[PDB]
Amino acid sequence: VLMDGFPYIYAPVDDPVDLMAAVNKLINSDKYRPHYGKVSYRDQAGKWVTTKDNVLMGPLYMM
Amino acid sequence: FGARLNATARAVITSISDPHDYDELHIPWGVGCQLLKYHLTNKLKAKFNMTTREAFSFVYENVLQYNQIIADLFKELIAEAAPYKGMGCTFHRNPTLQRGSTQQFFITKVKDDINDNSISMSVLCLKAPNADFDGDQLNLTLMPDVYLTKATERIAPHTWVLSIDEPHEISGNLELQGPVVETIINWAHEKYLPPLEEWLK
Amino acid sequence: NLNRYKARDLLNLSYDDLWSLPSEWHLIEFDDGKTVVSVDRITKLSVLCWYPLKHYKDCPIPSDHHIDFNRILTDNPKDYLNVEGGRVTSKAMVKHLNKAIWNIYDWSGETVDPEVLSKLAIEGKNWLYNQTTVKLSEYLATLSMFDIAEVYNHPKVREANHNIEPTTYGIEKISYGKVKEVFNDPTQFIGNSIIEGLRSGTQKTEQLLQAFAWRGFPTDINSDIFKYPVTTGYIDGIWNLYENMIESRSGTKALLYNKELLRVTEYFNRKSQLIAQYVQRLHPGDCKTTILAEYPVTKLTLKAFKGKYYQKEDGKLDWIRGNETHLIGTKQKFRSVFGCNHPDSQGICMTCYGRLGINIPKGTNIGQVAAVSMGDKITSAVLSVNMYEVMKRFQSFLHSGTYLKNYKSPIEALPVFATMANEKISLNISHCEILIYAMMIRSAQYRDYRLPKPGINGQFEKYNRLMQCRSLGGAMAFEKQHEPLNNPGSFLNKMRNDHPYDLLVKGGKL
Ligand SMILES: [Zn+2]
Numbered sequence: 106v107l108m109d110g111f112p113y114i115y116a117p118v119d120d121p122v123d124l125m126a127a128v129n130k131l132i133n134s135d136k137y138r139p140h141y142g143k144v145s146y147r148d149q150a151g152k153w154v155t156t157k158d159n160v161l162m163g164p165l166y167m168m
Numbered sequence: 169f170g171a172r173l174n175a176t177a178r179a180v181i182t183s184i185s186d187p188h189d190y191d192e193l194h195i196p197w198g199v200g201c202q203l204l205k206y207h208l209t210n211k212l213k214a215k216f217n218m219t220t221r222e223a224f225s226f227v228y229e230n231v232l233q234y235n236q237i238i239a240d241l242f243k244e245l246i247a248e249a250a251p252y253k254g255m256g257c258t259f260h261r262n263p264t265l266q267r268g269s270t271q272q273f274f275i276t277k278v279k280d281d282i283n284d285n286s287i288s289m290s291v292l293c294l295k296a297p298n299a300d301f302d303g304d305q306l307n308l309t310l311m312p313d314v315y316l317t318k319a320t321e322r323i324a325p326h327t328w329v330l331s332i333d334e335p336h337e338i339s340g341n342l343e344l345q346g347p348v349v350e351t352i353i354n355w356a357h358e359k360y361l362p363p364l365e366e367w368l369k
Numbered sequence: 370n371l372n373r374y375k376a377r378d379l380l381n382l383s384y385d386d387l388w389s390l391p392s393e394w395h396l397i398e399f400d401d402g403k404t405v406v407s408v409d410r411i412t413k414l415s416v417l418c419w420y421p422l423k424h425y426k427d428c429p430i431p432s433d434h435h436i437d438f439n440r441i442l443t444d445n446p447k448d449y450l451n452v453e454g455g456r457v458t459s460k461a462m463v464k465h466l467n468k469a470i471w472n473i474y475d476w477s478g479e480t481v482d483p484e485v486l487s488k489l490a491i492e493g494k495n496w497l498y499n500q501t502t503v504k505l506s507e508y509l510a511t512l513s514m515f516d517i518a519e520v521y522n523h524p525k526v527r528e529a530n531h532n533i534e535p536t537t538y539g540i541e542k543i544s545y546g547k548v549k550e551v552f553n554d555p556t557q558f559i560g561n562s563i564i565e566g567l568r569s570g571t572q573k574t575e576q577l578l579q580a581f582a583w584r585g586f587p588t589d590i591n592s593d594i595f596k597y598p599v600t601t602g603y604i605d606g607i608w609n610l611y612e613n614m615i616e617s618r619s620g621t622k623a624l625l626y627n628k629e630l631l632r633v634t635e636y637f638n639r640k641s642q643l644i645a646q647y648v649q650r651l652h653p654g655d656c657k658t659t660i661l662a663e664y665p666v667t668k669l670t671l672k673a674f675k676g677k678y679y680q681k682e683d684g685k686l687d688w689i690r691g692n693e694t695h696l697i698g699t700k701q702k703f704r705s706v707f708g709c710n711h712p713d714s715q716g717i718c719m720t721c722y723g724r725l726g727i728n729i730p731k732g733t734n735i736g737q738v739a740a741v742s743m744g745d746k747i748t749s750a751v752l753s754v755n756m757y758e759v760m761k762r763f764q765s766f767l768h769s770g771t772y773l774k775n776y777k778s779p780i781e782a783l784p785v786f787a788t789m790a791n792e793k794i795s796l797n798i799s800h801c802e803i804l805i806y807a808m809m810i811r812s813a814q815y816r817d818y819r820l821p822k823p824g825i826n827g828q829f830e831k832y833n834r835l836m837q838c839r840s841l842g843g844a845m846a847f848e849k850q851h852e853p854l855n856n857p858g859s860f861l862n863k864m865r866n867d868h869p870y871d872l873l874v875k876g877g878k879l
Binding site (some may be wrong): 119123124125128129132141148149150152154155156157158159160161163 | 502503506507508509510511513514515517518521522604605606608
């Protein structure tokens with residue numbers, strides 16, 4: 106896990122898990138709550154700005 | 169009642185999301201070299217004293233690679249179309265039913281990246297032709313002279329603004345896109361001030 | 370406290386100055402004598418929508434131009450202290466631009482070219498896009514599972530998913546009703562990305578209800594319903610074989626034989642446009658005709674009468690604004706296409722057409738506009754009682770194969786067609802008159818197939834006979850081009866109307 110930098114997750118189609126119950130657990134957890142803060146980027150005017158809202162960054166499999 | 173015209177192009181489209189004018193068009197490098205072959209040949213012969221054979225060889229050689237000399241000529245051609253913003257052209261979307269599926273634009277820029285083979289279109293003129301980015305190849309036709317450029321002004325983008333269904337109303341084609349509206353309402357309707365009663369204390 | 374600004378003064382500021390106004394409650398003073406209490410951000414957005422008025426310095430700005438035009442400062446503080454202002458939508462921004470251009474048009478005395486205003490409107494929208502996307506780069510909206518949890522965890526949303534009768538009434542009315550009540554409460558979900566978009570029209574309740582409430586009853590490929598419903602929303606998921614399989618039939622229903630639909634719609638659009646093009650020009654002015662038209666006004670066709678001039682009492686002309694409910698159930702005398710006396714043998718005046726002719730760009734074939742308007746709405750509905758049957762019904766009525774040729778006068782036929790058209794789609798009366806007028810001939814006995822002038826002295830004819838006997842240029846562009854060449858009548862010197870395709874048949878010669 107440390108070398109890869111990511112724990113690979115086995116998620117079978119017939120997994121007996123309540124999805125929104127799992128989401129609620131993660132939000133209310135002191136251990137596994139994902140970082141939820143602002144982000145900074147350079148806009149189309151060339152100015153370095155930071156967002157007012159909290160933005161979450163996550164992975165997606167793209168092809 | 170139909171024809172396959174000369175001086176035409178066909179490619180997929182993308183968006184111009186940066187600050188821009190609604191009636192301007194950006195064409196890819198490869199399309200620019202082949203479409204404007206005789207415009208470039210005229211400039212090369214005069215400025216660089218090339219022969220016709222050398223000019224034709226020079227243009228075809230640089231279709232698939234960037235060339236600084238060609239890039240300078242492209243801007244000079246666009247800047248010489250004054251008082252128009254650029255070179256007049258018409259963009260067609262199929263099937264053609266309503267006014268808006270055929271629009272007149274001005275070529276104002278030839279893209280410097282050769283890996284992009286799409287014609288960038290203004291985001292304010294996508295609703296009228298019902299154009300999307302999912303495999304939509306549009307047809308471009310270059311206007312040869314000023315006489316036809318004035319004639320095709322009748323299908324300029326502003327000509328579909330007023331609604332043809334209800335009097336004294338603006339068509340729904342002018343409404344902003346989803347992502348822009350969400351940003352505005354996130355700003356305008358934020359509770360950043362106390363209620364007016366508390367403001368007066 | 371409560372700094373005061375003038376509407377015209379704000380419009381004269383530079384863009385940097387406008388965006389530098391303080392964050393505050395303030396008073397905007399308008400030229401109609403009223404004042405509006407609002408916040409700076411709503412004021413800044415409203416000023417950007419007033420761009421056309423920048424080019425006309427003497428045009429007064431009434432208070433309805435502001436977005437929060439309902440919060441008017443009065444003597445009694447109980448009328449503005451707790452008043453909720455307007456909601457910013459993509460449609461609302463267009464409407465305020467619409468208000469500006471027609472305010473200029475009315476103030477000028479109907480002397481400003483509408484093409485000038487249309488250019489100002491799109492330019493103003495362009496400026497709004499340029500400024501907002503650059504200045505508001507810090508206010509981007511975002512979505513994540515954090516936003517989903519906010520809506521999902523609401524107590525009333527969670528109660529509309531338990532103890533529900535698995536029936537159409539129990540799901541679609543009771544369970545869906547509770548969720549709609551929560552989503553419409555202005556005090557709930559403040560700052561939520563999903564809900565704020567719903568209030569501004571970005572989202573729609575139909576998709577959201579199937580996501581947060583029970584999915585309901587999907588149909589099979591033959592439009593047959595199933596006895597049992599889907600007892601779960603999309604967010605929770607559908608993980609049992611029966612409900613998952615029946616839900617898949619919706620995706621099967623999504624993909625259909627649109628290739629045939631495209632073929633039929635294209636043929637219908639081509640057929641109607643070719644014949645409609647015989648009515649070419651729309652001249653501005655008034656022809657001063659004493660011929661009016663008596664039409665019934667109903668609750669279904671009142672909206673379709675917008676812009677039509679009707680002679681009220683004391684012999685004066687007024688035009689329908691769309692809210693004259695007192696006229697429903699009566700009969701009025703309208704200025705109609707069928708009564709025009711314009712010298713042009715294929716044209717009409719602005720007054721007989723109605724106020725909708727102001728929006729038409731100069732020099733446009735008026736017949737094509739009517740056909741495009743009808744075709745656009747039918748095609749949109751057909752591709753997205755079947756609308757295919759509706760399209761076939763309109764086609765058979767107009768082309769006479771309860772046919773248009775049955776009626777003896779155009780006046781008696783318009784309400785029948787207007788009711789038929791406005792029951793499914795929304796078609797203006799001006800468009801309806803043009804389409805019916807195109808099917809009219811002067812004298813069937815003498816084979817004079819030119820348009821009648823005025824249109825009340827003519828008769829109706831079938832589509833096929835008209836397309837082959839009016840002008841050979843139009844005939845050469847539809848079907849069976851060999852047949853008109855064999856017709857003996859094609860060789861006899863007659864007075865005939867012209868078609869736009871005449872020039873292309875001769876290759877450009879005159
Ligand atoms: Zn008239």
